[PDB]
């Protein structure tokens, strides 16, 4: 054909069918899915729907607060960076033999959010007892409508795929207790959550509210000066996020000793190194809080490393990795006609005006 840049591979136009994706035992073929999605292939829409809703029925049966054994690989934000998610699985271990816990923010910002969701939901269907997914602040209607996810679904699939995702996101658990030692959440603590029972009591099956404990678990952050406070305030309103709170070092230590925990493992803030360890608890000598962030070269500009945490009896191995190549997309998943046509219109008309004048 007359295709100019031959070296560039061409996405497949064939859309994967139900028999290609699911074998006759009901198990997704994740290898086949991985290869197709890496090529910017699509599923038939009914097949994407089946993955989304079958994942959601597994999520719906899980508790608000998950009980997760060591060893486990704990991952922070992904934000639609599907090609880095492929590398993450190499760094962290095969889901076939590694327990995983993801801490939310699978979608928005990166242009491959639906591929991340289809892949992780497929993995959840295949490994229901060893792969765990928490809710992040982006996994809701309000943010995906303002950021890119709703538009991504409209252009790649349809709004039914979007609506099914929104129902699936409502079923995501809010928190995990890992190795009976760590509380894992996307954002952090609430002035209304003093015990683990306070998490178990929540009704999670809804759009996150604008305030309250569910909001706080997904949205709160440590103080900028966490550990080095001169504000004896445990929870101060989070003016950067516009909701929820900043929590202080004494707030965290209070929660930890009250509940006999070692640390809070959370995500939600980008880190140059892919992780950050905060001030040690004096009772234990271990960081009171750790942020993990798993999106390398975030937004294609931060130039950060990503990391995951591989926790195993008596050792926290933090494993860093760098970004991988990914395909180009115009803003808002615009096609080249929509992008260029107004300019074409004005430039032809302008030519003729100058010729006729």
């Amino acid at each position: 054909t007359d295709r100019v840049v031959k070296a560039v591979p061409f996405p497949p136009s064939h859309r994967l069918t139900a028999k290609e994706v699911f074998d006759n035992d009901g198990k997704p073929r994740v290898d086949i899915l991985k290869a197709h999605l890496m090529k910017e292939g699509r599923l038939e829409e009914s097949v994407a729907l089946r993955i989304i809703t079958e994942g959601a029925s597994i999520l719906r049966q899980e508790k608000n607060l998950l009980d997760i054994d060591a060893p486990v690989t704990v991952c922070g934000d992904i934000h639609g960076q599907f090609f880095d998610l492929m590398k993450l699985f190499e760094v962290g271990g095969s889901p076939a033999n590694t327990r995983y816990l993801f801490l939310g923010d699978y979608v928005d910002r990166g242009y491959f959010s639906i591929e991340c969701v289809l892949y992780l939901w497929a993995l959840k269907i295949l490994y229901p007892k060893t792969l765990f997914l928490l809710r992040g602040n982006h996994e809701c209607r309000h943010l995906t409508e303002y950021f890119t996810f709703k538009q991504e679904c409209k252009i790649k699939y349809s709004e039914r795929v979007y609506d099914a995702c929104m129902d699936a996101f409502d079923c995501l658990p809010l928190a995990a207790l890992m190795n009976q030692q760590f509380l894992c959440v996307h954002g952090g603590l609430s002035p209304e959550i003093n015990t683990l029972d306070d998490i178990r009591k929540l009704d999670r099956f809804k759009e996150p509210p604008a305030y309250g404990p569910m909001c706080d678990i997904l949205w709160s952050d440590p103080l900028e000066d966490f550990g080095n406070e001169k504000t004896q305030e445990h929870f101060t309103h989070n003016t950067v996020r516009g909701c929820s709170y900043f929590y202080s070092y004494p707030a965290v230590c209070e929660f930890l000793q009250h509940n006999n925990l070692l640390s809070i493992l959370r995500a939600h803030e980008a880190q140059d190194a892919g992780y950050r360890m905060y001030r040690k608890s004096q009772t234990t000598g271990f960081p009171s809080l750790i942020t993990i962030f798993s999106a390398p070269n975030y937004l294609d500009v931060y130039n950060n490393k990503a990391a995951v945490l591989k926790y195993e009896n008596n050792v926290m191995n933090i494993r860093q990795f760098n970004c991988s190549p990914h395909p180009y997309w115009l803003p808002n998943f615009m096609d080249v006609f929509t992008w260029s046509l107004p300019f074409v219109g004005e430039k032809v008309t302008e030519m003729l005006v100058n010729v006729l004048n």
């Binding site: 190499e90 271990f286 008596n314 926290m316 860093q320 990795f321």
Partner: peptide
Amino acid sequence: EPIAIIITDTE
């Protein structure tokens, strides 16, 4: 019993 942290790159 203070657990150890080991940080390595993969890349």
